[PDB]
Structure 1
């Protein structure tokens, strides 16, 4: 899949995007690659942060669905008009599909100044699409309309401008040049988000020793659309305590641990070895097995170049608290080649050929670990009457 290698770009902390075309003749837009959502939505009206947008009137193949869509989320929203048009990925498979497209006509805190993307590609399942699960997501349409295998994989590679990032989205396959060592699979627990189960967490080889349901409260997901590793409150607190203890030779302000303040060292002198590795053990394909993915401080301490002190290497702490479960965001994914094997309801992890490391430690994927009489680490979200009332024909 040589032609699909290196097809992702972006600015650090602002999401990875792929080039796509919409309409006839093709209109090129840069589109955020988001495994944590399920809509294909593109700027389709002027906005201060857009240099360009989808011009429906310029497309001979555009069809209006005569239905609006409204998408609120934590401290943001986008909304607009549903339709269909022809869509391709120039540095993807050699195919063109008719997909649903939400034409974004109004938004708040959605577009990011300087991110260089104009839309979002939700790669998750129909269950979480808006307005409802009857709006077929892009990848479903791609698979149904073409011979493209039902799988994609992601290799995310992490003074006045933010650092440029790159990576690969391989659609329809696995490219062996993008990883080394073994490729380990964890089940997709349920097809909505890419939900997985964490069975154990270690910080510098030390078990956090929590009830494993705490690791997945109220879910754990793999999300390219989240920068940070996000952890449930109780888990976050235990992790921060352990990371603080390991790095105790340095006394950082509270602002740092909250991700609200950078910490710096003289260029090239960053004491990586005082920061511990973090291991997440993921449920294996076999009942009582797990494997671990291990990330370095090179992943969870994000580089931010400072104008005021350009002679220093400065870092943001990129592990943060969640009230909506574990989020394995870019912090996790940057260590690994991640295979979203939809066909076989599983997610694969292998050491990425592009991950940032040093001569002492490396991001790792290791297994199997077998546990006698494995507990169920999955959390069952309480059923609301709202959700229960839904008929599913």
Structure 2
């Protein structure tokens, strides 16, 4: 209900992610940690890498314990490798607890840290199934819930534009949203996987087989900036957005995120761009609800210059900061569901605003999931 201590506890820079202040070891070492719902490892820089403001100095900690095991984590972009261990962790602007969590001390990395960023680690908030090296390395939130009375739930209000937000650990803060929370089931506990059952570009359906919206999955990810769509869905959506926005012309490289587009300050054509609606599977048979985003969310500022923050993916749909910045999101792990409500801080205009509406009647929603 009321968690004032944790309100406004997230910071960042546009495109550089959202981070929370954390402490590791005894005596406490303060580090800024990127909040990521799309991964399950608690990894922190442990060496004097030049881009880092600070790093975890194990030698200074009495409570540190070596697991005598390493981990090599490759990505499409980045890569990091580290040494596994456990130590005492706390979240200053979080609950008043201390937990013994697994920590991957990063000893080598490539394209992982950002030059100019104010974070030194990553807090993977997803499930054990996608943990590295394997599902036996218990994620932080699982340790937090197992060792304390903190309820198995956390919520994220990502505000956007120097960026801010809130991570309410163990509860919900009703001051962070307007209207009602609508819940979608977590299909499987690995990533925060959900099912998209319909897509509308300015009230008009894309009329695709809903199985295509979730090929091979759809996930809620605070660590990705964009709304990432499967190629087929992306082609369809772009063709539809391009058509809805043919009042002003743009280079074809722009829709492909290869070129920026620029206009005048105080006069950016918002109304020439359509709203995007995703219909998510509801809690009840044949019942869905829809979430609506504004061009304010998918036209990312980089006079003014913007980026088309909707892109193709071969890993499925990724409901990144583009989606999350319009809503207050509840990761209700206890009830295996994700809640969406209109954010009290989302960026809109006098005309249109983000919306969470329901219920709707959608038949065969289970057939939208990929097997």
Distance, in Å, in 2 between the alignment partners of 1:222 and 1:271 is 29
CA contact (8 A) 1:78 1:106 kept: yes
Q: Structure 1 81/373 Cα, relative in aligned 2: closer, same or farther at 3 Å?
A: closer
Deviation at 1:375, TM superposition (A): 5.3
Give the length in aligned residue pairs.
368
Equivalent residue, structure 2, for 1:358: 349
SS at the partner of 2:115? coil
SS at the partner of 1:54? coil
Distance, in Å, in 2 between the alignment partners of 1:176 and 1:130 is 35
Deviation at 1:371, TM superposition (A): 2.6
Distance, in Å, in 2 between the alignment partners of 1:36 and 1:198 is 17
The answer to whether the aligner puts 1:218 opposite 2:241 as a matched pair is no
SS at the partner of 1:153? strand
Deviation at 1:260, TM superposition (A): 2.2
Deviation at 1:253, TM superposition (A): 1.1
Deviation at 1:376, TM superposition (A): 1.7
- Choose the corresponding residue for 1:227, options 225, 228, 241: 225
Gaps of 5+ in 1: 304-311, 381-393
Gaps of 5+ in 2: none
Distance, in Å, in 1 between the alignment partners of 2:127 and 2:24 is 21
Q: Structure 1 125/373 Cα, relative in aligned 2: closer, same or farther at 3 Å?
A: closer
Q: Structure 1 53/294 Cα, relative in aligned 2: closer, same or farther at 3 Å?
A: same
Deviation at 1:259, TM superposition (A): 1.5
SS at the partner of 1:65? strand
Deviation at 1:372, TM superposition (A): 4.5
Distance, in Å, in 1 between the alignment partners of 2:142 and 2:184 is 21
Distance, in Å, in 2 between the alignment partners of 1:176 and 1:27 is 32
SS at the partner of 2:59? helix
Equivalent residue, structure 2, for 1:80: 82
Tell me the TM-score normalised to structure 2 length. Answer: 0.98
CA contact (8 A) 1:15 1:115 kept: no
Q: Deviations over 1:302-340 (max 9, x none)?
A: 11xxxxxxxx12211100000110000000000000000
Deviation at 1:194, TM superposition (A): 0.2
RMSD between aligned residues: 0.8
CA contact (8 A) 2:281 2:365 kept: no
- Choose the corresponding residue for 1:324, options 298, 315, 337: 315
Distance, in Å, in 2 between the alignment partners of 1:324 and 1:52 is 33
Q: Deviations over 1:137-173 (max 9, x none)?
A: 0000000000000000000001xxxx60000000000
CA contact (8 A) 2:89 2:99 kept: yes
Deviation at 1:255, TM superposition (A): 2.3
Q: Deviations over 1:219-271 (max 9, x none)?
A: 00000010000000000000111110111011111221112222111111011
Distance, in Å, in 1 between the alignment partners of 2:197 and 2:112 is 34
Distance, in Å, in 2 between the alignment partners of 1:378 and 1:371 is 14
Deviation at 1:191, TM superposition (A): 0.1
Distance, in Å, in 2 between the alignment partners of 1:335 and 1:225 is 16
- Choose the corresponding residue for 1:272, options 229, 253, 270: 270
Distance, in Å, in 2 between the alignment partners of 1:6 and 1:259 is 31
CA contact (8 A) 2:45 2:105 kept: yes
Distance, in Å, in 1 between the alignment partners of 2:120 and 2:293 is 31
Deviation at 1:75, TM superposition (A): 2.5
Distance, in Å, in 2 between the alignment partners of 1:120 and 1:371 is 38
Distance, in Å, in 2 between the alignment partners of 1:96 and 1:16 is 22
Q: Structure 1 324/373 Cα, relative in aligned 2: closer, same or farther at 3 Å?
A: closer
Deviates more, 1:46-55 or 1:3-12: 46-55
Tell me the TM-score normalised to structure 1 length. Answer: 0.93
SS at the partner of 1:92? coil
Equivalent residue, structure 2, for 1:206: 204
CA contact (8 A) 1:296 1:363 kept: yes
Distance, in Å, in 2 between the alignment partners of 1:371 and 1:21 is 46
CA contact (8 A) 2:42 2:121 kept: yes
CA contact (8 A) 1:179 1:353 kept: yes
Equivalent residue, structure 2, for 1:384: none
Aligned ranges 1:280-359 → 2 under 5 Å: 280-303=278-301, 312-359=303-350
SS at the partner of 1:298? helix
